[PDB]
Amino acid sequence: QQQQIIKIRITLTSTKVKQLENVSSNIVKNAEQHNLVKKGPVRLPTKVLKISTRKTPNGEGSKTWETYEMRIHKRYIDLEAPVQIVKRITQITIEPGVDVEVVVASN
Amino acid sequence: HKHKKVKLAVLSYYKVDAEGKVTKLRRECSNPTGVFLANHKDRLYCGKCHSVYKVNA
């Protein structure tokens, strides 16, 4: 409760890299002036969701195909912080379009 | 395409002044919905027993 290590991992997933990198920057900064020992934001390979469809609602025409894409960007940060203050600072100001998962480890 | 719904009165109950007490045979059993049922040909139509019915008359 009083200055105790937590072994936290904050996993950030999104389809919008700009805001995903804003939240990542906010986390790293809040670790910085709070003097943490943190493992920097690890960027996982982008996942490209591809859907290939015929363009024509019927079947007539030249056989033209479309490949729609969704890009999923995944990052995660590891922190060793007291639970109360980081919970207060990270529960709040959750930017839209970014899914945040905070998980405790026993490593 | 149904029963005629004729003006049926109470059946299986004979009278009340039948020289001189009420005469209703087939004393009250555990079938209240007592009540009289269908007999087709040595059979009775299971009307209330959702689980068990072991009786023949």
Partner: protein, 53 residues
């Protein structure tokens, strides 16, 4: 009181339909869209699927 009103629809075409139009044909099942190809085209932008290359 109706035992004759249902035949198995657990697998195959008849077991699935578009969540938008209820069509069993051209259905996209990747990632659990369960939308037909025509409706996906008309709705890909606000699902998050875009054309880049």
């Amino acid at each position: 009181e109706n035992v004759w009103f249902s035949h198995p629809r657990r697998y195959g075409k008849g077991s699935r339909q578009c969540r938008v139009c209820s069509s069993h044909t051209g259905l996209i099942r990747k990632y659990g869209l369960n939308i037909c190809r025509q409706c996906f085209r008309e709705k890909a932008n606000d699902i998050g699927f875009n054309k880049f290359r």
